[PDB]
């Protein structure tokens, strides 16, 4: 995340990190057996890190449940990054406490111009290499579908949002991938692309959420 603030110690009860020995990408806590992430996340030998603030220190409120399985959306297209999303099973069910808490799914769409909360481990500068150890958050709004598609001609899909700021300054960046994005309670999107990071034109680009809910209701009650 770039230009962002630490979080402070789970004050995002539901955000988690996949570890293949070592964070690789987040993810939500949507129950205690689930979580969505995104599909370009996907890798073999995944465990789920919850309840975490500094990914380097066991400070004592983490759980580490390493998955049973994994589902890739069935349309994900790696090349445009259409419908990136994926589900994770745990192996076993999370503990929810005031530290390791679950995330709703959306009932609808939200509007342009929400205001968002997006947090990860990913790069902090726009220009360099500099990842944190602790969480880092940022407030962001949703931007009209119109400066999204300007942004990126010919290459969003209605499943696919843009969250940002066109100056530039804040934006999430990589290690940030698959993460949340949480708009007045629910989980509206996935970190999943963008050009650079926090470049002046070029906001970040999610999975939007509220497309998927059947999918994920149906595939985690089937699974
Ligand atoms: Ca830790
Ligand atoms: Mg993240």
């Given at each position: 995340?770039?230009?962002?603030?630490?979080?402070?110690?789970?004050?995002?009860?539901?955000?988690?990190?996949?570890?293949?020995?070592?964070?690789?990408?987040?993810?939500?806590?949507?129950?205690?057996?689930?979580?969505?992430?995104?599909?370009?996340?996907y890798?073999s030998?995944?465990?789920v890190?919850?309840?975490?603030?500094?990914?380097?220190?066991?400070?004592?409120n983490?759980?580490?449940?390493?998955?049973?399985?994994?589902?890739?959306?069935?349309?994900?297209?790696?090349?445009?990054?259409?419908?990136?999303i994926?589900?994770?099973?745990?192996?076993?069910?999370?503990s929810?406490?005031?530290?390791?808490?679950?995330?709703?799914?959306?009932?609808?769409?939200?509007?342009?111009?929400?205001?968002?909360?997006?947090?990860?481990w990913?790069?902090?500068?726009?220009?360099?290499?500099?990842?944190?150890?602790?969480?880092?958050?940022?407030?962001?709004?949703?931007?009209?579908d119109?400066?999204?598609?300007?942004?990126?001609?010919?290459?969003?899909?209605?499943?696919?949002?843009?969250?940002?700021?066109?100056?530039?300054?804040?934006?999430?960046?990589?290690?940030?991938?698959?993460?949340?994005?949480?708009?007045?309670?629910?989980?509206?999107?996935?970190?999943?692309?963008?050009?650079?990071?926090?470049?002046?034109?070029?906001?970040?680009?999610?999975?939007?959420?509220?497309?998927?809910?059947?999918?994920?209701?149906q595939?985690?009650?089937?699974?």
């Amino acid at each position: 995340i770039v230009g962002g603030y630490t979080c402070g110690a789970n004050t995002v009860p539901y955000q988690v990190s996949l570890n293949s020995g070592y964070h690789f990408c987040g993810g939500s806590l949507i129950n205690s057996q689930w979580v969505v992430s995104a599909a370009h996340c996907y890798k073999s030998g995944i465990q789920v890190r919850l309840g975490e603030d500094n990914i380097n220190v066991v400070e004592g409120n983490e759980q580490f449940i390493s998955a049973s399985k994994s589902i890739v959306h069935p349309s994900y297209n790696s090349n445009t990054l259409n419908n990136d999303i994926m589900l994770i099973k745990l192996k076993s069910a999370a503990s929810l406490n005031s530290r390791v808490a679950s995330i709703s799914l959306p009932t609808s769409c939200a509007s342009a111009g929400t205001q968002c909360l997006i947090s990860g481990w990913g790069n902090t500068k726009s220009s360099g290499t500099s990842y944190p150890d602790v969480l880092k958050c940022l407030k962001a709004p949703i931007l009209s579908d119109s400066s999204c598609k300007s942004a990126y001609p010919g290459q969003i899909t209605s499943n696919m949002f843009c969250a940002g700021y066109l100056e530039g300054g804040k934006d999430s960046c990589q290690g940030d991938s698959g993460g949340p994005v949480v708009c007045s309670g629910k989980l509206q999107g996935i970190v999943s692309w963008g050009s650079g990071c926090a470049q002046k034109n070029k906001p970040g680009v999610y999975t939007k959420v509220c497309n998927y809910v059947s999918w994920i209701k149906q595939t985690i009650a089937s699974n």
